Structures are given as C-alpha cells and as structure tokens.
Ligand binder design. Structure first.
Ligand SMILES: O=C(O)COc1nc(Cl)c(Cl)cc1Cl
Ligand SMILES: O=C(O)COc1nc(Cl)c(Cl)cc1Cl
Ligand code: NA
Ligand code: NA
Lengths: 115, 116, 116, 115
C-alpha cells in the first residue's frame, strides 16, 4: 500500500486507537472527492487505504477526526479535526506515511516518503 | 485583536516572514466563506485580521500557505498548506493565537486561548 | 536580554506558568556549571536570565522542569525535564529564544536566533 | 526488547539513518552511567538496546547525536544533541518507544508506552 496513516496520543503516551481517518482527492472542479477511509488500529495505524493502481498523482487531503477521539476520552479539545494536504508525486519515493501526534490544543504532522 | 497568527521557521531558526494566511468561516450552507487574510510580518506575526465585533461564534479555518513560503525560498515542500480548523467564541469572546512551526515535510500547530 | 525562554501548555492551550528553568554552561573541566535560573511568568515567558556581558561564548544547557510543572497540576508526566543544549555566540553575540510546547508524554522545542 | 528509539527527519521527509544514540542510567552518586548505544537503521529505528532483565526501574537518559546527523547532510544545526530523560516505572505498560522528529533548529520527542 502506497499510503499509511499513523496517529499518536501525547497525553497518554499511546497510539491513538479507533480514530476515524478520511482521505479525499481533489477533483477537476476543485472539490474534495471521497477517496478512502478507515479507523486506526490498536497500534494507531491505518493500512490498506488504497493501491498503487488507484493512488495516482494529484492533491490529497487526509482528515483525522481528532475531536471525536478526545471526546471519547472525556477530554475537551480545540480542533474540529487535523487536515494534511499534499501532492502525490511519481518522481518521489513510492511510499507515503502521514504521521500525526495529537494533544488537545496542538498537533504535529510529518510525512515520511520512502522507496 | 481577538485572532493572531504566528509562524516560525524550524530550518532557519527564525520567524517565518511574508507567509500568506487566509481565514474562512463556515456558512449556513456549510461552505467555507472568506473571512479575512493577511501576511506575517518580520516578527512572523499577523495582527489585525479581525475585530471583536466581526469575530462572532462559528467554525473557522486558518489556512497557512506554507507551500508558497518554502517555494519562495527555493525549496520544494511536502504540504500544500497547513489548515487549522476550530470552533471559536461559543462560550463567549476569547482571544486566540494560532501558532505554527514549519519544516519542509512537517509542521506543528498550537492554540493559545485566553479570556479578555 | 540575549536569552529568553517561552513555554506553552498543549493540554490547556495556555502559557505554561511558574515553570522552573535552570541554565548551565559547560566549564573548562567539561562539567555543567550553574549559570542562571528563574520561573516563567503569567505569559509563559522568562526574561532577564542574563546580560550581554555575562552571556559569553560557550555550550549552554537550558533545563525546563516539566515534571514539577505537571505534578503541580495533579498529573504524572513521562519526562523528568526538557533539556536544550546548544553552542551560543560563537560567531558573535546573538539573541536566543528557546521555546517549548509541553504535553504529559511529549514536548517540542525550537530556537529563534536573531542578530541584535 | 523493552526500549526502542525511532528518529525521523522533517527536512527530507525520511527516517533519520545512521544517527548515534546513547542511553545512560542515573547511578546512585547522581552521575550518568553508560547503559546502551547504537546507530539507527535504514528505517530510523534502533532495536536491541537492552533486555527486560537489565532494564530495571530508574532514571534513564537517551542522547541522540543530532548535530553529527545534520553535519553529515551539509546542514547547519542548532542543538548539540537531543536529550530525553525519563523514569522507567514497572507499574506502567512494558514497552517504551522514544520517538524524535528532527529539524535543524527544532525537535519534537514523544513517548509511546504500551503493554
Ligand atoms: O513561540 C511562540 O511565541 C508561540 O508559538 C510557538 N510556541 C512554541 Cl512553545 C513552539 Cl515550540 C512553537 C511555536 Cl510556533
Ligand atoms: O513514531 C512513528 O512511528 C511515526 O510518527 C511519529 N514519529 C515521531 Cl518521530 C514523532 Cl515525535 C511523532 C510521530 Cl506521530
Ligand atoms: Na454557546
Ligand atoms: Na568563533
């Protein structure tokens, strides 16, 4: 799979488990088209979102439903969600990992692109 | 000044200067309506986006145009921009600072919320 | 004020107030010599640690006592403290802001370095 | 292994490869005793540092030689190294992952403690 998402919890020092993730692809009319989605596993990871065939070049948005995650833990959060927007490029290494570290009023995201 | 944006550059250890910022507010029809925009100063700070009267309850999106920043410095970054989406003022007026720390393949964002 | 420390709380979305900070400087015998200390104010900022005359070339360690901060708030955190170690002023005097963003099991730190 | 270290590079969007990592344990006389060390793999990870038998409760310091990493890439860095100092506690989950995300003038570190 060319696209993986990993989510960590900075308050509990744990993977962020059962977090909803939605992936969108920018369509020609400039709107966001549903592309793939799922929920992070017990390791905070979401595998199997797409295939090499389907993951063509383009602009993609990964939406991490952080607000629901914190609410389920009884913790009051700031953001509605975390959004990661990037261009997939065939020249570059082949595999994309979108990692996010979550706190109630902050998040960090990085991209690990490898061959 | 109930909304301020601050942007730092993690590669240079400096304020991120001349970063374009667009603010949107979700409308009744659930689309993103333009609300305010500006560019960060020499200190990396963007003041004067809105007023207490204008900055009503709602869901706001702060778009930080990180790609245009890195590309103006001769660098090809990963993200198109950084998007910070939050409900504001739903327990009354607050002051929000949206801070962001930028690297070519990563960014952090945090919010400081104070009661005037 | 060539050295300033700023600390934010990522759980509350607020400045991290009353955070103890200890600064050390590596001595000729390669031990850490106490250099300055203080506590962050209501803004999360610690000013007045040192002077331009006193803040000479060297390797400095800024210890931020994150554990005592979280424990004073009734929380059991992971780290003992956050340590920021850097060479300073080796191309002449600079102004350093050491910023840190704190969560119970995580912290970020960045440096803003400017030329007076 | 109860202790793993992972290092990522925020400038290149890649694992931080061949980074030296030194682990120390605080001794009774308040000095730092060498405990384990190694270099991150091609995945940015350092496995096999210690064993359950040796990793007793105590205060540990993980030192990541970030300055040498950046110099080898021709990039001018700020920090001498990144230090992560924490108490190992037997009540807690058993496995500790110390993760660090590196930029030239900034770094983030988080702890993932799982069972
Ligand atoms: O630095 C500021 O004044 C506010 O923004 C920030 N604050 C901290 Cl503590 C970090 Cl690590 C990064 C940023 Cl961008
Ligand atoms: O830890 C991973 O496996 C990848 O994701 C991450 N990696 C690092 Cl280094 C930090 Cl500090 C945070 C995250 Cl979310
Ligand atoms: Na309300
Ligand atoms: Na010199």
């Amino acid at each position: 799979c060319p696209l993986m998402v990993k989510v960590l919890d900075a308050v509990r020092g744990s993977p962020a488990i059962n977090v909803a993730v939605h992936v969108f692809r920018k369509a020609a009319d400039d709107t966001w088209e549903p592309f793939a989605s799922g929920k992070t596993s017990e390791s905070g990871e979401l595998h199997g979102l797409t295939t090499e065939e389907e993951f063509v070049e383009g602009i993609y948005k990964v939406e991490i439903d952080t607000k629901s995650y914190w609410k389920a833990l009884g913790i009051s959060p700031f953001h509605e969600h975390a959004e990661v927007v990037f261009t997939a490029n065939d020249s570059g290494p082949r595999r994309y990992t979108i990692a996010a570290l979550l706190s109630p009023y902050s998040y960090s995201t990085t991209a690990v692109v490898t061959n």
